[PDB]
Amino acid sequence: LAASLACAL
């Protein structure tokens, strides 16, 4: 989950 946020942005 965390990585998805960082990747997204």
Ligand SMILES: [Hg+2]
């Ligand atoms: Hg990305």
Ligand SMILES: [Hg+2]
């Ligand atoms: Hg990524």
Ligand SMILES: [Hg+2]
């Ligand atoms: Hg990058």
